[PDB]
Design a binder for these strands. Sequence first.
RNA 1: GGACUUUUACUUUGAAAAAAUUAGAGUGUUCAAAGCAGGCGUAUUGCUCGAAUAUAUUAGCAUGGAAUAAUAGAAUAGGACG
RNA 2: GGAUAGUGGCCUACCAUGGUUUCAACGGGUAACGGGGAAUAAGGGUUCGAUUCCGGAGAGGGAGCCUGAGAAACGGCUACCACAUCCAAGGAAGGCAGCAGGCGCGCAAAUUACCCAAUCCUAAUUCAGGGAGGUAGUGACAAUAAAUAACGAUACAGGGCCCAUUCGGGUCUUGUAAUUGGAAUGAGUACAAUGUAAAUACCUUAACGAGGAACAAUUGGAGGGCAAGUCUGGUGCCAGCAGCCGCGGUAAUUCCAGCUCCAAUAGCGUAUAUUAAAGUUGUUGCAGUUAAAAAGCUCGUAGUUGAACUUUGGGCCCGGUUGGCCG
Lengths: 67, 185, 144, 60
Amino acid sequence: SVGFGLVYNSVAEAKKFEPTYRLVRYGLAEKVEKASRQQRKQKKNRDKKIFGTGKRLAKKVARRNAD
Amino acid sequence: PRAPRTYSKTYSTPKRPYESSRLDAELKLAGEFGLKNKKEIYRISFQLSKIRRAARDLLTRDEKDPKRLFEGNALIRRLVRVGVLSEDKKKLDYVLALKVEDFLERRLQTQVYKLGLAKSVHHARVLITQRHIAVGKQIVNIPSFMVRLDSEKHIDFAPTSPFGGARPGRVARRNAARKAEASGE
Amino acid sequence: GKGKPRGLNSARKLRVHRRNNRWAENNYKKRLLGTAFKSSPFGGSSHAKGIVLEKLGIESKQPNSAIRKCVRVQLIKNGKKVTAFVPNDGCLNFVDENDEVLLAGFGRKGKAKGDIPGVRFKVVKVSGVSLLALWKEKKEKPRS
Amino acid sequence: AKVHGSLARAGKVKSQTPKVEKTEKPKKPKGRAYKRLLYTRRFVNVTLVNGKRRMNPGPS
RNA sequence: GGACUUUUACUUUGAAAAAAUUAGAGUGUUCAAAGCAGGCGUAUUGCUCGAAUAUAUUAGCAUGGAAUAAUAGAAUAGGACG
RNA sequence: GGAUAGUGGCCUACCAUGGUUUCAACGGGUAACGGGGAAUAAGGGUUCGAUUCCGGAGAGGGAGCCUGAGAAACGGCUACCACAUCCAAGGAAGGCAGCAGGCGCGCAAAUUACCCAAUCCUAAUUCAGGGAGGUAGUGACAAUAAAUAACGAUACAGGGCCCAUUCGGGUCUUGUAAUUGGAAUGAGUACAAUGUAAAUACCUUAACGAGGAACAAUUGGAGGGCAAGUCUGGUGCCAGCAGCCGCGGUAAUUCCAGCUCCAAUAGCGUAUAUUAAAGUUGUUGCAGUUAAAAAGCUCGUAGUUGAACUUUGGGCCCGGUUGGCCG
């Protein structure tokens, strides 16, 4: 079997110069998994439709719960 | 948007469809060498036919023309390295001669037989294709491999498989299982 | 030197003449006028589908003496009508009228084939399935 | 010429030909082996030379 | 640097010239279509071959040719050089 | 002069009468984007290029324009034309010839999946983003390699061949065998490790996986061109065949079938087109008395073409490149 190998001059230098997926393969990095790609995108595209923090809009649509 | 992964074909195909004589000869080559396709012949006769072409075109050139020299001699050394062109006849007039048989006879198919190991070109086939025999420690399972002259000294058996040690194989051990389970405990 | 101008500058006259006489080549003419599209029941396409009007029994030419089973077909793409033979033994048993069939040429560029007059096409498939598989037994003609 | 003939008889002969089923027979070797059998047939053992040669004769 | 030069076609060599594609050299993708790799040791702290060449015509530039084939000239000498 | 970033009838004003054309203008046609190219192999050619690179053009049709270094931008705005969505009838919205996916059209073409790990691009920028781009799915488009079996024994038969006065079978194998024999292998299944962003296959590799019920090759053809029956049964100018010549009307070498055989072979048939064959487009290279074709005749412009003759002959040098006989 033939492949390739690296060996860093530190452990900090390895944890800083390495691809993160490798660190995941080894035992040095959690897989902080997140919302799906299109899930994320869709969340951003929801986010775009709002100007400001949003709380004023939430309370103004809470004003709707009467009229 | 990427690059074209180029390709080409390796066989031509006879102009006349049913010329009984050529069918005879083609058949003879097939049965003699243990080929499954007429294609396996066509292929060769196409490869060769390109060589010859390249040959003719050079022959028309002036003697000691840079291209005739460099490329002609390159082709010559190439046809020697494998085992098709003899060291005797070695100045591209024999490459204008030549024939398919010389190519045919140089296959791993043919070599793993012609000096033992087979007793038949078919046993040669069946052996090769079944992960037996190697050149280096490099196993090869292609009937049309072409044994490259100086590799002729290395057509032994495989480090694995029977006939070259390592393990009998699932069938033999299945029979050993039947003996050990019947005749004993 | 028989007609043709042999001079060194008479290129013009020569290729001009070549065009002129190219026009007497039947398939040059037809490829250039546009006939493949203009005329022809198919639009210049290789195949064409179409619905079955009625079932015909076309008496063959001489010196043969039979009845050639065919159908009249209206091509979907272009509404043109055209009569198509139904190959093999039976197969006129496989159609039924108002059915949606698949026609191909007869391999003569127009030109009716054998003893069948004016039929330049044939049936290849019916109802979605191949007529061949039907004639054997591989497949069976769909619902309706 | 006449166009509306009779379709009453289409598929006649096939439909009235006695069905004989296929005869179960020895397996024929698929591949290089068929070419083998073919070689040893045509150019090894030789059947006959009735004047010339016959690739498929019946009774004679 | 100053002063003037009849115009052409043909042919040669050259420059200017993307790649991929083709023709084609090298390398055993196990073979092969391909890819442009790879090959070697001290295989515990390197060593190293490459990644060629060819065609790329018509027109434009540049250069050598002076056959072939055109073109211009001194007859109301309003000619040639000084 | 104006206008432009600037050259210019680009536009305006004044003024003139010019500009192109049988060496084919102008107009029409194109199922016409252009090129690198592709298919076809004696050569000369013929045919084709919407399509992985380059250039141009467009974003349903047209115009207009804001912003800006750069747009006449459309995943920007404005108006009109066509289309069309939501409504509380007051109004408000959309532009897949991006990625998928749907309808329609048809002879004709795949997933509403995963990722920024590579290749690269952009931003205030090492991080953020990228349906660019990569990943797999579906995929007999085209292309490569090439499993479906290999080897003994044995039952009579042989051709070999020494001997033949004559049984014969005898050990060199030809193999046709309706009992056999143990060997062999991946197709698949599947620890493991490898692969990968994560996966899936592949190259690896434990346990498995071949005897005919199999892990079982197909597509056409067997009158000729054209490789392969003058077999049996069926039909009887019917049904059917047949690219073409032709077969079929009671012994069918072409139909429907069984047998046997051929050809190509994980592929084979077909329909359309195209190239070769085609010296049947003929520059190379056709043909025109009678087969297709010399205009009734002469003039004659454009066009093609067009006799001969002008430094030939002798002498000397210089230095190259092969090759010979020697080395």
